[PDB]
Design a binder for this molecule. Structure first.
Ligand SMILES: Cc1cc2nc3c(=O)[nH]c(=O)nc-3n(C[C@H](O)[C@H](O)[C@H](O)COP(=O)(O)O)c2cc1C
Length: 107
């Protein structure tokens, strides 16, 4: 499986992270207890381009796969480029269940 990914549940308030891979915890410097249950926007900060955040918001609204790149921050404030791939996960009836978010490659 992908080294660095999270899964969110959009059927819970504010689309919380319900799983974060070990590689995601290592890169972001947060513990599982600091990540589970919150929206992934906490990785954004002052240099994050709001035009890209808007593209993400639109892709989530329309429930479409997309790939964007935006500046994120580790727990200690280190900036990193996140080439973020978002994938909706649907059931057999076509109903949205989860989103997968993969950080593609990278530093
Ligand atoms: C599965 C998934 C993973 C996400 N991962 C990140 C991420 O790693 N970094 C980030 O800045 N935003 C990430 N987001 C985007 C935010 O959670 C949020 O959708 C975005 O900031 C736009 O919504 P808002 O305007 O309410 O903040 C992710 C979203 C989803 C659904």
């Amino acid at each position: 499986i992908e080294k660095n990914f999270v899964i969110t549940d959009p059927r819970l308030p504010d689309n919380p992270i319900i799983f974060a891979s070990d590689g995601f915890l290592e890169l972001t410097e947060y513990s599982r207890e600091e990540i589970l249950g919150r929206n992934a926007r906490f990785l954004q900060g002052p240099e994050t381009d709001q035009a890209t955040v808007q593209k993400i918001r639109d892709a989530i609204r329309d429930q479409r796969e997309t790939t964007v790149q935006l500046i994120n921050y580790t727990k200690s404030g280190k900036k990193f480029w996140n080439l973020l791939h978002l994938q909706p996960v649907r059931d057999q009836k076509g109903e949205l269940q989860y989103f997968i978010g993969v950080k593609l490659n990278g530093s």
